Every structure is written in structure tokens, then in C-alpha cells.
Design a protein around this ligand. Structure first.
Ligand code: SF4
Ligand code: SF4
Ligand code: SF4
Ligand code: SF4
Ligand code: FES
Lengths: 79, 72, 666
């Protein structure tokens, strides 16, 4: 569960919103050479609003974790 | 066919391009060869003579001889 | 003679031999009932309420279309005329369905006022209860045909003043109706620009702006203030109506100028929509994904603490707004350019400004003013659109283009790699492929000054010889052409010079300058340049660790500029609103005065200054902008040295007249 949070490339939180309000914030750009689209934050357009997802982006956007031995390594990752 | 009327009225507006007038004869000849003035015909007349759609619809519906729907 | 005199209501009136009776009456003070008459539109003659009779002649003459002739006596009020006018009003009421109880214009309708002044308390006619369509398909404008007098002032405003000929009359007779394109609803019509010139021209409550219904009645206002629209460079004069600290209606003064009072969708929708926004009203702090209220000392202390720790290491910048006044720009420049010796002081539109100026300077060093007034497009014969889309940058320029191309028989040709901003008025779309087409264009116009080669100069232009050939052929057959150069062409200060050279290579001269008419995106272009705009582009190149952004959150900003602001690791915004794109990328969000709260002069590109008046006085006490500039000057170790405004210097002087010189500086 939870809310969607986008962090600027320098730490500032930009448009942390609720999952159901995604059509107001995310748009997909289509390019002719790929069956894959390019989602991007709508208020910054393409290809400036494009972001990263995944473990790195997760641990960068999240502020803390809820388990001991993963927090003990999340600190080492943050530093 | 809605694609037939496009070129068919292109060939009727051809003798009238850039002649400063003669729109009601264009509409008269599109009425003679179709029995009515469809929306496609009016749109193409407006795009060819570069006359606004409001003007061509106003003059098409001003006279009782013309008809905007297929007639019986 | 050109100086006649009449006698209206016994009162002797003066006038000129060319005017009508209604003009001579309105010229002194004299009153005549009118419903279809609009200052700025050719007299129509439809309501027949302006009827007037002379002594001796029992005929009745429409005072708005009959010329004035010295020696005639005019009678406006008697039993016969009152009876006839009351009968006309009763016909109008009995024919259509007038429900004053819930009309939006139920206190400022010309028909209702004419009915009350003639003591109408019955219609005397059988009240034809016909079903007329109410068109509310467009979210902004509503057309309720139950209230139509068929004065045609909407059909005359969208044709002669706007150009977007969207309205006309449907089937004749009593079944007359005002329709959109091909009988469609307003929302299906593609030839509409949503300018609301029709709503301003309608005397009744048929056409109505929907979101300000029941509030934008001119009869129940608190104050009327005239100022200028800050959004674009055209600078249209407005007639703001204020009611309970809110702008309820923006009307276009200037029904004598070629604009005709038609304002753009922005000028009469955003400006009244701006007064009902969220109003920061207190310094904030990000706190992480959710702002927090702070005192001025705390916010300014943290902002200056992060501003010092970045200015020592060469990394700091300021992105100011060109919709600001000359005094605010002077203060910002006094802090940043003449107190901190900063080098990164760009503006949200700095690229367009620096491009236009560095493309027009090849002509300032030879004494020619390389542009003309924007209203000459009506008097031209061939309008060439160079990398421009005026419907999104200068709508009144697009209105000039449409009027000239649809009612004054002008030809249109596009010379851009874009969407052909007028799909249906252009007859020659020349799409250029990118790369280095600037020297190609300048060599192409070199031949038009000498021979009037082409194939060699038409390869990077991506045109087969024939395409460029008849381009030149139509360019040479035009006696008074004009070029519209857009803000896209300012991606290289070379293409601006290329356009200005195509102007001289075809003898496109006017007594104020060349036929170039650049489309500037703001109104304080020269003001921003002399004060704030930088000489070299730096945004999106310098990473930047601190950033001050003053944005009057009115017009949107380019995605690239906002992406550069989002990666600056600290942004201090001084916007007056809590709009989405700035509250998303900001760390402090200090409050500032809005455009309808301060005065200024708006030094423009063509020379002498405009004037913006304060419409609604400031509500709270933000108490300064100099305050922030001192608390940044202090806490940093500099003096501000308060200057006064730099005068308008008429950057491009008209020294020598229309003596062209191709500039091989490519
Ligand atoms: S348009 Fe005027 S006369 Fe008609 S209902 Fe509205 S207020 Fe009354
Ligand atoms: S909004 Fe403007 S373009 Fe549209 S119908 Fe009204 S006046 Fe014409
Ligand atoms: S909509 Fe308004 S301006 Fe247009 S004809 Fe009807 S009453 Fe006149
Ligand atoms: S055209 Fe420009 S000056 Fe005129 S109303 Fe629109 S934004 Fe304001
Ligand atoms: S107002 Fe004089 S005729 Fe319409």
C-alpha cells in the first residue's frame, strides 16, 4: 500500500500523491522505434519529467524502513 | 460515397477558384448533381474557396431551393 | 464645409458632414435608444429603435444609418415614437422567451433597460411559446437562443474584428438563428478561438461567460479600473470590474483601435480567475512533502543561510519573471547585478529576448528599425509565417492575420518546421528540415536583391528546385508583404537575421521600420534586457546549488526551465499564488504582491512605456519586496544602493529611412 512519491534529483519531494490520482500526474509518450512507451511526470513534460523506479529509486524516495537488519544496511546505503 | 462527392465537387469548384463571386451557382450545380447539399459537400466547398463554413451554411439555408437533407 | 450643425431636441449640435445623426447625437451628450448599434462596427439597421423624424417630413429615419445634413430639425421623443418603440420591444418580448428572473444579465441587459425606460408592463401579443435551443456544450460560453434580438453584433464581431468567422445566420425569416460552423454546437466548431468578443458584443443575455455568471454584472460592481493586460506583448487596454475584492469581468477598451476590444482567452478568463486563487500570504517551509507556516525571520534566515553557503562557491542563480514591472526588475538587478556581481540572472523568457536582440543588432549598427507595428498585417498582401504560432503567443496578431486573409484578400505562406498554425488559410506550406538552414535562407534571398544558384541554396532547405522557385516567384510579385517571426526562430540569433534579411530582399518597408513584427512573449522585453536578462545562456547547463525564482504565476513555463529548477537542490520562490508547478518545486515559497496590486510602467520593445494601474488594493501586510532584498543583502555583507529606474532609450532608432542593406553576417 501507500502513496506515490517522486523525489527530485537532489532530495526534494515533488508531488507525493495518492495512487488513484495518477492520470493527473503521469503521461505516456510514444516513440516509433519501440513497443515500449515512456511514462513521465506531466508537469515537466518529456523527456524532462522522466524518472526512475526500482530498488534504487525506492530506497532513495523512502525515508526509513521498518525492519532492524535492513535498517542497519539502509543507513550504510544512504551514506 | 462520401469520398466520391469530395472529388466530384472539387471538379465543380475548379472553374470558380479565384473569381470573386459565384458561390450560389456552385451550390446550384451541387444540388443539380446530388439532389441535396450534404455536409461533406459544404465542408469541401468551404475548404476550396477558402470561404468560412458559417457563410456557406448561411447561404445554403437562406434559399428554399436548396436542401441540407436527402430529399424524397 | 466638413462642419455642419443640426438641432436635436431643440438643442443645437455640431458635427461633420460625413457622420450619421446618431453620431452627432452621441457626440455632444444627446440620447437616442439603440440596441443593434455598437461603437467600432459598421451600422447594421435591425432593431429600428433609433427611429427619428424631422419637422414637416412624416417619414421615420434610422438615426444610426442616415447621414447628417446641416439645417435639419430632429425630434427624438414624441407620442408616435414612444408608441412605435414600445411596440417593437413588446414584439421582441412576445416572440422569444425572456425570463428576467434567472437571466445572468438581468440587471445589465440593453433590452431590459429599454423596456423599463419605456414603461413596459405588458406585451399585448399572444406570447408565441416556441422552443429554442440552449447551447451549453462549450464549458466556457453559453448561447441561450431564448434571449436573441437578432442584432447580429456577434456575427459582426467574429467576422470583422476577430476573423474567426464562426457565427452566421441560419434559415431566413422568423426561423433565423445564430449558428456555429455548419449548424454545429460551439464545442464542435474548430474555427473558434474562445476569445469572448461575442459575449462582450451581445447586448442581451444570449451569449454569456459561464463561470462568472450572476457575478459579472456591471450594474452591481464596486469599482471600474482601466489598465493593461500583462500576459503578452500586444498590451491590450482593459476595463476591469471589481466586486468584493474580486475581478468579475474584463472588457476590452479600444473599440477605436484596430484590435477592436477583443481580448484573448487569457486576457478575459485568466485575469478574473487569478483573483480567486490560493494566495500564499505567509512564508512557508517545505518540511518534506507538506509545507509549514513560518515567521518572516525564520524563513529569511534559513533562505539566506543556504544562499550564502552557495554564493561563496560560485554556485548561485536567479530566474526572474519578465511580467514584472520596471521597478521590481530594477531592484532585483540592483541586488544581483550591481551588488552581488552575479552572472546567472536569466529570465524565464531570456532565450527569446537575447535571440531577438542579437538577431536584430546587425541592423542597429546601420540605423534601421528592424520591425513594424503589429497592426499593419491588415494592410499587407502576403503574410509569411516564419517559425511562429501566434494563436499561442499573440492572439491579436492572429486576428489581424485572419481578418487580412479572409476579408482583405491576403495570401499566406508558412516557412517553419511546425504544424502550419493556420490550417486552412495558407496556400504554400514550406517545411524546413533542421540543421543549418540559416545560411541557406540568407543565400536564397541574396539572389532576390541581385538577379531580381537557387538549386545550390535549396538543399538544406529540403525543397526540390521547383518548390523554392515558386516561393521566390510569389515573394517577388507582392507589392507590400510582411513577415511574422516567431519565438521558435530565436533558438539561434542567426535565423532572426535571416528573416530580417528576407524582409529587405523583398522591399517590405514601412514608415516605422521593416515588415518583421517579432512576437515577443512578454511586455517588459527591453526592461528585462537592460536590467535582468543575461548575455549567455546558463540554465540547464550549470547544475546550480541555489536558485531564486520570482514568478508571477500567470503564464505557464517551458518544461525545460522547470526541469532545470527541479534539479537545483534549493529553490526560493516568491510567487503570490499556491499554484501546482511552483509549489511542487520550491523550498520556501515567500509571498509577493500580485499583478492586480502594484503599479508599473512596462518598458516595451518599440520604445515608450505603458502603465499598469493597481486594481484591487493589497489585502494583507506583506509590506515589501525591498525587505527581502535587504535581508539578502544583509546576512551576506553587501550594500543595496537603491537606484531609480533606467529611462527608455529607444534601442532601435529610426535614423535613416528604409535604405536596406543585406547583412552577410550569418
Ligand atoms: S436577456 Fe435581458 S430581457 Fe431577456 S431575459 Fe435576460 S435580462 Fe431579461
Ligand atoms: S469566442 Fe471568439 S471566436 Fe468564438 S464565437 Fe465568440 S467571438 Fe467568435
Ligand atoms: S447572440 Fe446576442 S449579439 Fe448575437 S444576434 Fe443574438 S442578441 Fe445579437
Ligand atoms: S492578446 Fe496579449 S495583451 Fe491582448 S488580452 Fe491577450 S494576453 Fe492580453
Ligand atoms: S439602432 Fe438605429 S437601426 Fe438599429
Amino acid at each position: 500500500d501507500g502513496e506515490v512519491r517522486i523525489k527530485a534529483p537532489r532530495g526534494r519531494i515533488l508531488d507525493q500523491f495518492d495512487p488513484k490520482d495518477y492520470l493527473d500526474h503521469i503521461g505516456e509518450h510514444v516513440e516509433p522505434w519501440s513497443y515500449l512507451k515512456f511514462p513521465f511526470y506531466k508537469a515537466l513534460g518529456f523527456p524532462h519529467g522522466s524518472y526512475r523506479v526500482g530498488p534504487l529509486a525506492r530506497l532513495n524516495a523512502a525515508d526509513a524502513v521498518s525492519t532492524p537488519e535492513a535498517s542497519k544496511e539502509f543507513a550504510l546505503y544512504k551514506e | 460515397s462520401t469520398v466520391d462527392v469530395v472529388e466530384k465537387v472539387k471538379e465543380i469548384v475548379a472553374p470558380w477558384k479565384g473569381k470573386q463571386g459565384g458561390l450560389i451557382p456552385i451550390l446550384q450545380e451541387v444540388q443539380r448533381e446530388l439532389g441535396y447539399l450534404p455536409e461533406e459537400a459544404l465542408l469541401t466547398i468551404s475548404r476550396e474557396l477558402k470561404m468560412p463554413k458559417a457563410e456557406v451554411y448561411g447561404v445554403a439555408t437562406f434559399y428554399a431551393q436548396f436542401h441540407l437533407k436527402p430529399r424524397g | 464645409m466638413k462642419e455642419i450643425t443640426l438641432t436635436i431636441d431643440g438643442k443645437v449640435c455640431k458635427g461633420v458632414q460625413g457622420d450619421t445623426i446618431l453620431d452627432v447625437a452621441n457626440k455632444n451628450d444627446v440620447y437616442i435608444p439603440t440596441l443593434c448599434y455598437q461603437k467600432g462596427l459598421t451600422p447594421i439597421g435591425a432593431c429600428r429603435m433609433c427611429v427619428v423624424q424631422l419637422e414637416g417630413n412624416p417619414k421615420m429615419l434610422p438615426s444610426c444609418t442616415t447621414p447628417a445634413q446641416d439645417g435639419m430639425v430632429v425630434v427624438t421623443k414624441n407620442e408616435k415614437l414612444k408608441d412605435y418603440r414600445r411596440q417593437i420591444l413588446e414584439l421582441l418580448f412576445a416572440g422569444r422567451n425572456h425570463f428576467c428572473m434567472y437571466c445572468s444579465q438581468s440587471g445589465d441587459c440593453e433590452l431590459q433597460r429599454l423596456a423599463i425606460e419605456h414603461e413596459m408592463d405588458s406585451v399585448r401579443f399572444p406570447y408565441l411559446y416556441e422552443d429554442f435551443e440552449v447551447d451549453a456544450t462549450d464549458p466556457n460560453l453559453m448561447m441561450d437562443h431564448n434571449r436573441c434580438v437578432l442584432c447580429q453584433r456577434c456575427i459582426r464581431t467574429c467576422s470583422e474584428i476577430v476573423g474567426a468567422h464562426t457565427l452566421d445566420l441560419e434559415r431566413r425569416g422568423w426561423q433565423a438563428k445564430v449558428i456555429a460552423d455548419l449548424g454545429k454546437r460551439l464545442r464542435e466548431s474548430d474555427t473558434c478561438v474562445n476569445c469572448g468578443a461575442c459575449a462582450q458584443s451581445c447586448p442581451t443575455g444570449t451569449i454569456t461567460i459561464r463561470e462568472f455568471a450572476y457575478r459579472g454584472r456591471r450594474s452591481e460592481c464596486d469599482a471600474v479600473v482601466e489598465s493593461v493586460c500583462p500576459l503578452c506583448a500586444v498590451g491590450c487596454k482593459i476595463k476591469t470590474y471589481v466586486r468584493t475584492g474580486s475581478i468579475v469581468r474584463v472588457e476590452g477598451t479600444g473599440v477605436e483601435e484596430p484590435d477592436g476590444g477583443q481580448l484573448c482567452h487569457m486576457g478575459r478568463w485568466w485575469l478574473p480567475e487569478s483573483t480567486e486563487r490560493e494566495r500564499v500570504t505567509v512564508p512557508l517551509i517545505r518540511e518534506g512533502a507538506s509545507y509549514r507556516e513560518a515567521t518572516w525571520e525564520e524563513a529569511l534566515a534559513l533562505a539566506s543561510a543556504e544562499f550564502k553557503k552557495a554564493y561563496d562557491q560560485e554556485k548561485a542563480g536567479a530566474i526572474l519573471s519578465s511580467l514584472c514591472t520596471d521597478e521590481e526588475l530594477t531592484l532585483f538587478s540592483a541586488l544581483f547585478r550591481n551588488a552581488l556581481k552575479m552572472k546567472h540572472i536569466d529570465t524565464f523568457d531570456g532565450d527569446i529576448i537575447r535571440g531577438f536582440f542579437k538577431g536584430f543588432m546587425p541592423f542597429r549598427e546601420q540605423g534601421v528599425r528592424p520591425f513594424t507595428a503589429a497592426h499593419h498585417i491588415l494592410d499587407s498582401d502576403l503574410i509569411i509565417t516564419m517559425f511562429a504560432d501566434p494563436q499561442k503567443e499573440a492572439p491579436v496578431v492572429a486576428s489581424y492575420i485572419r481578418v487580412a486573409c479572409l476579408h482583405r484578400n491576403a495570401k499566406l505562406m508558412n516557412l517553419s518546421y511546425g504544424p502550419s498554425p493556420f490550417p486552412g488559410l495558407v496556400d504554400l506550406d514550406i517545411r524546413l528540415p533542421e540543421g543549418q538552414a540559416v545560411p541557406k535562407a540568407l543565400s536564397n534571398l541574396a539572389e532576390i536583391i541581385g538577379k531580381i544558384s537557387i538549386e545550390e541554396s535549396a538543399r538544406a532547405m529540403g525543397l526540390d528546385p521547383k518548390i523554392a522557385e515558386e516561393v521566390a516567384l510569389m515573394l517577388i510579385s507582392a507589392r507590400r508583404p510582411i513577415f511574422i517571426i516567431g519565438g521558435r526562430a530565436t533558438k539561434s540569433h542567426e535565423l532572426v537575421t535571416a528573416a530580417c534579411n528576407l524582409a529587405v530582399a523583398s522591399k517590405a518597408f514601412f514608415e516605422d521600420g521593416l515588415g518583421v513584427v517579432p512576437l515577443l512573449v512578454s511586455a517588459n522585453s527591453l526592461g528585462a534586457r537592460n536590467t535582468v536578462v543575461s548575455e549567455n545562456p546558463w540554465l540547464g547547463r550549470e547544475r546550480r546549488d541555489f536558485l531564486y525564482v520570482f514568478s508571477t504565476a500567470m503564464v505557464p513555463e517551458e518544461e525545460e526551465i522547470l526541469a532545470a529548477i527541479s534539479a537545483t537542490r534549493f529553490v526560493v520562490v516568491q510567487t503570490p499564488f499556491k499554484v501546482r508547478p511552483l509549489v511542487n518545486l520550491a523550498d520556501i515559497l515567500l509571498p509577493a504582491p500580485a499583478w492586480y496590486e502594484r503599479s508599473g510602467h512596462f518598458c516595451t520593445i518599440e520604445g515608450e512605456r505603458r502603465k499598469l494601474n493597481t486594481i484591487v488594493p493589497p489585502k494583507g501586510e506583506i509590506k515589501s519586496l525591498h525587505y527581502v532584498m535587504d535581508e539578502f543583502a544583509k546576512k551576506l555583507g553587501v550594500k543595496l544602493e537603491r537606484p531609480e529606474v533606467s529611462p527608455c532609450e529607444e534601442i532601435f532608432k529610426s535614423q535613416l529611412r528604409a535604405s536596406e542593406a543585406r547583412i552577410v553576417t550569418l
